[PDB]
Amino acid sequence: DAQEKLELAEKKATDAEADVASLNRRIQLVEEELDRAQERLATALQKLEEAEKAA
Amino acid sequence: DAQEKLELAEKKATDAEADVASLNRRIQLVEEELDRAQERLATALQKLEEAEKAA
């Protein structure tokens, strides 16, 4: 039982770590996409200022 | 040893869990900002369309 629990805890660690890595990938993807949304936002806001300023 | 490996693997998983949990908090917060930035962006872009119509 300790050994199976170990294989399962190791599996859980494997999966938790797979999830750490898969999420780290995803967190980074949302951080990168966030930076892009923020850059696009700064761009949209600058364009908004240009359009609004044109107006 | 199975029990120590189990406690350790449980901790590999607990730490991996703490890390994925940290990451899950980061994806939730960053992705929430991705979406808020995307929404702010959509807002800036919608405002841009209106600002351009106003232009």
Side-chain angles (χ1 to χ4, degrees), chain B residues 37-52:
Chain B
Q38 187 63 29
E39 183 63 17
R40 282 196 296 269
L41 173 59
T43 298
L45 292 171
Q46 290 161 354
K47 287 178 175 176
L48 175 58
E49 289 173 357
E50 294 303 309
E52 287 295 351

Side-chain angles (χ1 to χ4, degrees), chain A residues 23-40:
Chain A
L23 270 285
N24 191 48
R25 176 196 65 201
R26 290 286 300 116
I27 277 65
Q28 290 170 348
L29 289 169
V30 299
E31 288 173 350
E32 290 174 352
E33 186 63 36
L34 171 58
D35 287 345
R36 286 190 288 271
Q38 290 172 347
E39 290 166 353
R40 287 194 297 269

